[PDB]
Amino acid sequence: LSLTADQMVSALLDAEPPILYSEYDPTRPFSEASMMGLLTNLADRELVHMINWAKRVPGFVDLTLHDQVHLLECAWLEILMIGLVWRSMEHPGKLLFAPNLLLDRNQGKCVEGMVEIFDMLLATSSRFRMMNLQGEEFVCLKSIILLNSGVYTFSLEEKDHIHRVLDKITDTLIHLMAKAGLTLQQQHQRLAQLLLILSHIRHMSNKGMEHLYSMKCKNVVPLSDLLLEMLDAHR
């Protein structure tokens, strides 16, 4: 890649997917079927925008079509959750699923096994608030998840290309921290802090992926045709 650090950020920020709305009605109270219908409907529409966001991620179109499917199948719920955590940053104690859908930790109890996932998503958003995560770093992390969560489950030149694109986003992250006025020791620490949250996002995705399979078998609310294909990829 030839995109400089300032051009790397601009491309990622320009590719930011929209913030979709939900058909939630504040007059209608919540239930497990009502809530799971809204979240899966929202996640299904955000998928089609992520698929087009992935194409704009620098270096992603250079990969083969089969590799592009693998990276998305494994990291899609990771990208959805980190985007959710990023939107709920300035809304403590709540998860901003949609501009008209603020959910509490107590509201998340209307679905079985959902309260434990709300806490981790809440704690992750509280973590971004402590670090005061910037949008320039958020678009870098979200593109890292896309190119990292599935590169191990793999051709050597394609993996070589991914490792070169990942090193570019790393230098881009360090460049942002340098211009932000952080010492050479603080840039390494913040970089490490930003990469360790990616371990928790993988965990939230796994339990979130594991939770989606329970609803499918319980058949509480039917799942989308696209959302079900992603679910069979993991289990």
Binding site: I51, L65, L226, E229
Partner: peptide, 9 residues
């Protein structure tokens, strides 16, 4: 393969 189709635009 919906993902493969949507990626093939």
């Amino acid at each position: 393969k919906i993902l493969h189709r949507l990626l093939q635009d």
